[PDB]
Design a protein around this ligand. Structure first.
Ligand SMILES: Nc1ncnc2c1ncn2[C@@H]1O[C@H](CSCC[C@H](N)C(=O)O)[C@@H](O)[C@H]1O
Length: 214
């Protein structure tokens, strides 16, 4: 409620970017899809997926028990949601999966571990399966990165975000290892995804996807 409201204040085009992730999954997988949610946190993208796909099986995983406890509370009464404590770097669940989704999590990995993860994700996707990332992305240059930062700050100020939460936000972003969206899209092609695309973008934040065969 307050947490979800705060995420909208901190994330430019939250509805467009998380909404695009939901819409592209809904147009790519069945009603009864098996979906892996990597770095699920409180399960915010999971909640948006459940609203669109009431019959989908969600497996939420994260390295943080504390974050997954928030996801457990959110989905307390949902018998089609499982929770697994697992780092991105730990062995993935067997599969197959119709979709693997992630929001604002994969940027925390070293670049080589991102490329390895994309390869490992495709292995657990059925043919026609989709990988979707709602991601913090780096500008191609230092000058454009400053412009990305100004536009992010403009949203946070316009959204009337508490100064203490924005302060906390900037501190958490120090541990992020973002790269530009086109590099990551090319990495999906390198990983053997036949199609990769940026569906939606608001400067620093982008929704991109890869398809396993289609
Ligand atoms: N190496 C790693 N393996 C697994 N989870 C990781 C991780 N590095 C970061 N995370 C998780 O990634 C999340 C980033 S915050 C995003 C949370 C949620 N997907 C949302 O959109 O709101 C946190 O829950 C953090 O614990």
């Amino acid at each position: 409620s307050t947490y979800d409201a705060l995420r909208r204040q901190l994330i430019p085009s939250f509805d467009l970017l998380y909404g695009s992730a939901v819409s592209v999954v809904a147009m790519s997988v069945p009603a009864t899809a098996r979906i892996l949610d990597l770095g699920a946190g409180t399960g915010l993208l999971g909640a948006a997926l459940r609203e669109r796909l009431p019959d989908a099986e969600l497996l939420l995983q994260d390295r943080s028990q504390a974050m997954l406890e928030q996801a457990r509370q959110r989905f307390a009464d949902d018998d089609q949601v499982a929770i697994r404590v697992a780092d991105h770097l730990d062995e993935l669940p067997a599969g197959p999966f119709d979709a693997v989704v992630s929001a604002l999590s994969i940027n925390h990995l070293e670049h080589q571990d991102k490329q390895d993860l994309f390869t490992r994700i495709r292995k657990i996707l059925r043919p026609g399966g989709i990988f979707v990332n709602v991601e913090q992305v780096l500008a191609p240059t230092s000058e454009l990165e400053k412009m990305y930062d100004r536009q992010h700050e403009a949203h946070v100020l316009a959204s009337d975000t508490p100064a203490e939460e924005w302060a906390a936000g900037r501190e958490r972003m120090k541990h992020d290892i973002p790269i530009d969206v086109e590099t990551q899209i090319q990495w999906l092609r390198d990983a053997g995804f036949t199609t990769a695309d940026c569906l939606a973008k608001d400067w620093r934040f982008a929704t991109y996807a890869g398809w396993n065969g289609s």
